[PDB]
Amino acid sequence: NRGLYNMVNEYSQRLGVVIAGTDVFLEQPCSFLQEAF
Amino acid sequence: YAVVQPLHIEELTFGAVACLGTFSATDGWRRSAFNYRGSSLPVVEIDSFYSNVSDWEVIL
């Protein structure tokens, strides 16, 4: 949950400090979104 | 170990070994004498030494 909220709010509240860049991967979107198909 | 029943447990240890360092093999050592006014004192001289000390190791 911290990871997701951070991706969203960092992208938002940036673009307008240190820009130390978070690395993003798509391997485990079930781990990200807490959903099982 | 002729007489061991008097002293209880502390006298068990006999001696220790350490390693002063490593020098050139295939060269061995040499003989010389100490320079004092007194007498010869034959002495072993080794060259190109590298001191690498080690803690004491018990033997028994």
Binding site: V18, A20 | Y1, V4, V53
Partner: protein, 299 residues
């Protein structure tokens, strides 16, 4: 001639996190990867000492010996720079361990798992959600004494739990509490309770030690009686007398031939591995140590 391990933090540190680590400026940290670029998790001791899995002494010990050691060079929010440790090189190491133990020039330092509570040893990284736990680094004359007392105390604390009549907890606290070395006395705090089955950071050694000590007298006498030959070591005839009387009287026939080997084969592994633990893995040599500066030129 360049040895660096640059660790990239995924997220920026708090000002709190910085001052927490600046105090561990020169402390040794074990390193799982030798590559110049490494993950933050690899470097901690948290892999072996975790809230999740029971901490066992040999799990940490076996980990420390097969692990590269590194020294902290510069701590910045963006990344960590760690200086690797390699045999044949001289390094400058500072004393910052939470349990304080005074060092002296020309001593033999030791690396061992932290006997004391994790909070003193570990530093929480809340921004990155990792815990870097620092191994306890000690002079050798103390690291032996501290391990002897805490191990002996554990067996006594469980002895009274099996039976109240056996030993008094008062005398146990008296000898086993205080550690004296080189005119300096340090008090070590023992855990409050033994626990049901396994104490935190203890009893791994104890179960092995107490079985190896009972498997020994039967084995030692079996070895000699089969070992005597016509060319026997001269000292061998001598130390056959050193045994106590009752241990001499044993008959090897009582145990079956299937048992005797498995008692020996079970025992050898404990003894072979037991000896290594006493040695405390990696050993450091110190040249010059200045108490006011708190820095040692170790190699």
């Amino acid at each position: 001639m360049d040895l660096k391990v640059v660790v990239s933090l995924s997220s920026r540190l708090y000002t709190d996190e910085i001052a927490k680590m600046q105090q561990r400026i020169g402390c040794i940290l074990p390193l799982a990867s030798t590559h110049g670029t490494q993950n933050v998790q690899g470097l901690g001791l948290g892999q072996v000492y975790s809230l999740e899995t029971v901490p066992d002494y040999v799990s940490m010990y076996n980990y420390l010996s097969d692990c590269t050691l590194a020294v902290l060079d510069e701590v910045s929010v963006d990344s960590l720079i760690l200086t690797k440790i390699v045999p044949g090189q001289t390094y400058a190491i500072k004393n910052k361990y939470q349990p304080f133990f005074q060092w002296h020039g020309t001593g033999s330092l030791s690396v061992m798992p932290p006997v004391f509570g994790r909070e003193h040893a570990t530093v929480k990284l809340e921004s990155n959600d990792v815990d870097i736990v620092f191994p306890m680094v000690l002079p050798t004359p103390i690291a032996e004494e501290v391990l002897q007392k805490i191990l002996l105390f554990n067996v006594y604390s469980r002895v009274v739990m099996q039976a109240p009549g056996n030993a008094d907890m008062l005398d146990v606290h008296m000898h086993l509490g205080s550690v004296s070395y080189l005119g300096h006395h340090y008090e070590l705090a023992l855990p409050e309770v033994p626990g049901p089955l396994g104490l935190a950071l203890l009893d791994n050694l104890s179960l092995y030690f107490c079985i190896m000590v009972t498997l020994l007298p039967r084995a030692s006498m079996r070895l000699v009686r089969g070992l005597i030959r016509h060319e026997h070591h001269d000292l061998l005839n001598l130390f056959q007398e050193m045994v106590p009387d009752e241990i001499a009287r044993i008959d090897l026939d009582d145990l079956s031939v299937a048992d005797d080997l498995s008692r020996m084969r079970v025992m050898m592994t404990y003894l072979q591995s037991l000896a290594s633990l006493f040695n405390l893995g990696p050993r450091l040599a110190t040249a010059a140590y200045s108490q006011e500066t708190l820095t040692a030129t170790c190699w």
